[model samples]
Target: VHHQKLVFFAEDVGSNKGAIIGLMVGGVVIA
Candidate 1:
């Protein structure tokens, strides 16, 4: 079946800093 989903990826907080974590889908963390 098909369903609508919202995918989210961590926006880079900084080039030198890595705050990105737990990429998400449908607002739920998928990592």
Candidate 2:
């Protein structure tokens, strides 16, 4: 259960990071 919770936690953080990175790359591409 604890491991599963950690995995879910990581998933949330990973997606947030991906979104930030995605926007940064998008800006670079459009620039």
Candidate 3:
């Protein structure tokens, strides 16, 4: 339960920019 809580907090603060770049690269590959 403690590790689960820490993971949730880490995810909440993780860089959204990474997600955006991933999406962009995925779109380019798919296109």
Model 1 regions more than 4 Å off? 1-5, 11-31
Query: Which ranges in model 2 have alpha carbons more than 4 Å from their true place?
Result: 1-4, 9-31
State the local distance difference test value for candidate 2: 0.31
Residue 31 miss distance in model 1 (angstroms) = 20
lDDT of each: 0.45, 0.31, 0.33
Residue-by-residue lDDT tens digits, candidate 3, 1-31 = 2323322343356444432321232334321
**TM-score of each candidate structure, all chains considered together:** 0.16, 0.12, 0.13
lDDT of 2 by residue, 1-31 (tens): 2333322333344234232321232334321
Q: Which scores better on lDDT, 1 or 2?
A: 1
Candidate 1 lDDT by residue in tens digits, 1-31: 5544434645753353433444444664433
- Candidate 1 vs candidate 3: which has greater TM-score? 1
- Residue 19 displacement in candidate 2 (angstroms): 22
The best candidate by TM-score is 1
